[PDB]
């Protein structure tokens, strides 16, 4: 009598392996994330893969219904600035190049994400987050 | 105290995932018990007392009768998952009589998906004959038992029909000692018939053995039967060879085989040298008595240094043998931690002056090798080059001019162990066409190595082991506990079927007898695979005390 | 006691049936191992001395 | 660690009282159980 289970996780693009909370909440359901490596990998045909959340349900009967989302902000510095994997200490060794430019479209793709659900604000937040990963933002 | 029904039901599908489907319901908890209600024949059964020299079908005094209905309907309703008449019959309201009920629970049972959880109490004779009749009602016979897997003389699949009219195939399993008839074998036949006095045939080590008296353990007495049946079992006398779980054929039974891949696997190894060693071969033949009346364990002889190594699954297994060890063998044993296969090395590139200023009693005899040596990563190997600055050191100082190296490698200066992880690289020498027999310069190579390691850094390498850890999560929490407590690290993890398994590094010296440790670190829900890998150094101070010479 | 030479098997038991006969080596050699006994059981791939060096029969099958 | 000539408050859960004339260290955690010994 498993009424509802719209349970969510942090399922990156191409990891079909249902273990907790996909075991006792979505396996206590019959949630097929096979449909996640089949209707979401195909969905994110942009490049290929990316870390993107998910949200499947069992509706008292025994159904399935899901929603997916968006890829990280440490990816947008990595596959952009030429920060191969990580700069090791974001204070001392600044590797990549993200000036006032790039960061604009960068934060653009990620607007309903973030916080202030806009784009006339979080530009300097993403361009300040550059130092969390430590990338020399050139004075444009 | 704390009797149940429910919790059992739960724990089946909360440990494995097995549907019970039940058959009867109690009349009281702890000491509230008086008899038993049943949901098959629907009969208010009840005994009287402990020994139960009085039983009866007295009415249900109320309280629980009604509940049965709800509960009992499941039975009928579960018969909608396997039967045929019961889809419609339950959609109706027409009573399924006692006849197809039997057949249906029996159905799912033999088919493997149903579980007449009849229960009861032993000491106070209450629950007995009920379960007897439960056994008949839902326990089959070799008749319902599927095609017994065996093999042909060729190597193809064969079915072993009951066939009390064809082939004469058989198995045995238990070797009971008995001063009357002698070495006895509990046998499950299979096919054919076996007369008291007939012969047979070994079916692995050909030996047309004699059967003499077919006798079944008849409770107290032992019923002597002229003939043994196609499927039925018993003890047959004789079979002076005949071991455990081995294939046995009748004189006919055209030399087939029977499968039974049946294998156990060891996990706890210990080592032993008792008294003043004068007990060794004694316990050797004693062992010959061990793994032949029952296989179980191994006597694996140490590959490197002395001592035998006694290993096997269980634990107090090894130690109950230990109990019977100083019993019918009388042997002052000191079974402790095993040895540690030790190999050592260096950590630097040094050139040494392998100078050998010598004239002896004649025949020259010297070897001045300007040698240079270097090592290699953990578990790499041993390589070299001629390193010849022209031809300084001639040909016959090749086939073994090293070997003084290879030899001295066999006992690295410090504690004396094989020296792996090295890579040489000489570079110069000095000789004479007479003052350099093969012998001489090669021995110069020996000195070269010894003083090279002496002044090239000390270091041993304790044998490291890789291992699975087959463990349900919870106590993976606990086992990461003791594993990271055991001078090592893990490095690996994936969720399997029921459980989750850890790819592991551990140090052997700090890994001994871990199967017994795991036991309660987990309550015991899986083990591992003793997967050898390589070796590392024992952080100087561990090595230090272990420097004893 | 020696063995039938060429590749052993015996670690520490075998019940080698003490056979007999020296040779100008191993200051003894007498009382040989058997290759059959309670261990050893010959050399797999011995298409010859079946009478001793183990091998039931080089049954080609294929 | 009962009975030590020095006694203290280790975390923000451990608070000292006075009882029977001797100084006592409390903290819900009994592994910090200290007394002026």
């Amino acid at each position: 009598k498993k009424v509802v289970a719209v349970v969510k996780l942090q399922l990156p693009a191409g990891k079909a392996t249902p273990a907790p909370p996909v075991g006792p909440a979505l396996g206590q359901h019959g949630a097929n994330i096979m449909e996640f490596v089949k209707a979401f990998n195909a969905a994110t045909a942009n490049m290929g893969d990316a870390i993107v959340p998910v949200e499947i349900t069992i509706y008292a009967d025994r159904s399935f219904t899901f929603v997916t989302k968006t890829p990280p902000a440490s990816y947008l510095i990595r596959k952009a600035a030429g920060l191969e994997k990580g700069a090791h200490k974001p204070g001392r060794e600044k590797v990549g190049r993200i000036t006032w430019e790039q960061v604009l479209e960068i934060a653009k793709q990620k607007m309903p994400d973030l916080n202030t659900t806009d784009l006339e604000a979080a530009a300097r937040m993403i361009a300040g987050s550059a130092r969390s990963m430590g990338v020399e933002v050139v004075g444009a | 105290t704390g009797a149940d029904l429910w919790l059992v039901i739960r724990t089946m599908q909360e440990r494995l995932g097995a549907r019970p489907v039940v058959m009867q319901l109690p009349i009281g908890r702890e000491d509230t018990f008086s008899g038993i209600i049943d949901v098959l024949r629907m009969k208010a059964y009840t005994y009287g007392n402990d020994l139960g020299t009085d039983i009866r079908e007295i009415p249900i005094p109320e309280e629980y009768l009604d509940q049965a209905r709800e509960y009992h309907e499941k039975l009928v309703e579960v018969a909608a998952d396997f039967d045929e008449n019961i889809m419609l019959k339950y959609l109706e309201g027409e009573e399924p009589t006692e006849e197809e009920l039997v057949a249906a629970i029996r159905k799912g049972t033999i088919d493997l998906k149903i579980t007449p959880v009849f229960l009861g109490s032993a000491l106070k004779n209450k629950g007995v004959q009920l379960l007897l009749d439960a056994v008949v009602d839902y326990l089959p016979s070799p008749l319902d038992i599927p095609p017994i897997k065996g093999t042909t003389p060729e190597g193809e699949v064969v079915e072993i029909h009951p066939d009390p009219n064809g082939p004469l195939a058989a198995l045995a399993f238990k070797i009971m000692a008995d001063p009357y008839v002698g070495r006895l074998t509990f046998i499950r036949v299979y096919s054919g018939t076996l007369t008291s006095g007939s012969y047979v045939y070994n079916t692995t080590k050909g030996r047309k053995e004699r059967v003499a008296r077919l006798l079944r353990m008849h409770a107290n007495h032992r019923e002597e039967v002229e003939e043994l049946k196609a499927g039925d079992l018993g003890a047959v006398v004789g079979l002076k060879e005949t071991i455990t779980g081995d294939t046995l054929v009748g004189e006919d039974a055209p030399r087939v085989i029977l499968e039974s891949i049946e294998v156990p696997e060891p996990v706890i190894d210990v080592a032993i040298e008792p008294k003043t060693k004068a007990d060794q071969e004694k316990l050797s033949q004693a062992l010959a008595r061990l793994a032949e009346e029952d296989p179980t364990f191994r006597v694996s002889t140490h590959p490197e240094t002395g001592q035998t190594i006694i290993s096997g699954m269980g634990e107090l297994h090894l130690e109950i043998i230990v109990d019977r060890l100083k019993r019918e063998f009388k042997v002052d044993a000191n079974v402790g931690k095993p040895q540690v296969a030790y190999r050592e090395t260096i950590t630097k590139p040094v050139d040494v002056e392998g100078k050998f200023i010598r004239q002896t009693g004649g025949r020259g005899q010297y070897g001045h090798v300007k040698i240079k040596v270097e090592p290699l990563p953990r578990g790499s190997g041993f390589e070299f080059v001629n390193a010849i600055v022209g031809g300084v050191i001639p040909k016959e100082y090749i086939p073994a001019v090293q070997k003084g190296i290879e030899e001295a490698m066999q006992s690295g200066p410090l504690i004396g162990f094989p020296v792996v992880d090295i890579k040489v690289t000489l570079y110069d020498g000095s000789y004479h066409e007479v003052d350099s027999s093969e012998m001489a310069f090669k021995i110069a190579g020996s000195m070269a190595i010894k003083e090279a390691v002496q002044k090239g850094d000390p270091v041993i390498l304790e044998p490291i082991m890789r291992v699975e850890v087959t463990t349900p999560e919870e106590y993976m929490g606990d086992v990461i506990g003791d594993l990271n407590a055991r001078r090592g690290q893990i490095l690996g993890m994936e969720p399997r079927g029921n459980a989750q398994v850890i790819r592991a590094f551990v140090p052997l010296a700090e890994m001994f007898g871990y199967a017994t440790d795991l036991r309660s670190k987990t309550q015991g829900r899986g083990s591992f695979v003793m997967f050898f890998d390589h070796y590392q150094e024992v952080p100087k101070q561990v090595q230090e005390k272990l420097i004893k010479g | 006691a020696y063995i039938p030479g060429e590749g052993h098997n015996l670690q520490e038991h075998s019940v080698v049936l003490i056979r007999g006969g020296r040779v100008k080596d191993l200051p003894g050699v007498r009382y040989h191992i058997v290759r059959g006994v309670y261990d050893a059981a010959g050399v797999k791939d011995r298409k010859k001395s079946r009478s001793k060096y183990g091998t039931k029969k080089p049954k080609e099958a294929a | 660690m009962k009975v030590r000539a020095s006694v203290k408050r280790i975390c923000d859960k451990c608070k000292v009282i006075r009882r029977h004339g001797r100084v006592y260290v409390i903290c819900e955690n009994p592994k910090h159980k200290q007394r002026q010994g």
Partner: protein
């Protein structure tokens, strides 16, 4: 937590039951032998008597068992800690 007699008669895993009298100013009251209330017009007899009962039977001890006022059953790790 049987209430037989005027007394509170409990069997808390000890080899025998336990017999509590209701002295002055106090009665007991067992809504069910799984939980026990005591009647009393006195704050001392409250804490003290209830204490005396929980002192009839200690709580938890690593796992979970015994008597408690209505507090928290803090635990100590099971299949470990015994080297």
């Amino acid at each position: 937590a049987r209430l037989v007699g005027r007394a509170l008669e409990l069997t808390v895993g000890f080899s025998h039951p336990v017999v509590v009298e209701p002295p002055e100013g106090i009665t007991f009251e067992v809504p069910e032998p799984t939980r026990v209330r005591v009647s009393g017009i006195d704050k001392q007899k409250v804490g003290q008597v209830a204490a005396n009962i929980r002192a009839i039977r200690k709580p938890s001890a690593y796992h979970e068992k015994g008597i408690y006022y209505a507090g928290e059953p803090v635990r100590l790790k099971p299949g470990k800690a015994g080297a």
